């Protein structure tokens, strides 16, 4: 008889203890294709991005301060890398008679790009 424990608590009562107009799907999407293509501002909210860099650089060297311009350089570079990769993916999709990027479409692009 297989058994498993899920309460994960040796005792109960742990708390009591001492310790309308609507557009068709895609029209708004193309409108803000135009919006984010005519625009130049930076699309990954900064703070969250900076943090991504702190928790990931931590591995290579502790106590590594980053000049502000640097995390802005990492953002720009990351958004440029991903917009280039996403142009390629859309192509890797429009190739297969489709209009929806899918994970496979990007595991391939990166193989032809040779980034893998």
């Amino acid at each position: 008889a297989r058994t498993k424990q899920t309460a994960r608590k040796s005792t109960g009562g742990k708390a009591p203890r001492k310790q309308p107009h609507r557009y068709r799907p895609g029209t708004v999407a193309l409108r803000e294709i135009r919006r984010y293509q005519k625009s130049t501002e930076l699309l990954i909210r900064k703070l969250p991005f900076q943090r991504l860099v702190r928790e990931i650089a931590q591995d290579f060297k502790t106590d590594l301060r980053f000049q502000s311009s640097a995390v802005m350089a990492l953002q720009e570079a990351s958004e440029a890398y991903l917009v280039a990769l996403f142009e390629d993916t859309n192509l890797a999709a429009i190739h297969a008679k489709r209009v929806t990027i899918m994970p496979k479409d990007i595991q391939l692009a990166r193989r032809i790009r040779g980034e893998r």
């Binding site: 058994t3 498993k4 899920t6 309460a7």
Partner: peptide, 19 residues
């Protein structure tokens, strides 16, 4: 094989289960 669930099928509450 299939993994059982994390809740009782009778009372819908967590605890030690017989699978």
């Amino acid at each position: 094989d299939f993994e059982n669930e994390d809740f009782c099928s009778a009372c819908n509450q967590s605890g030690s289960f017989l699978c």
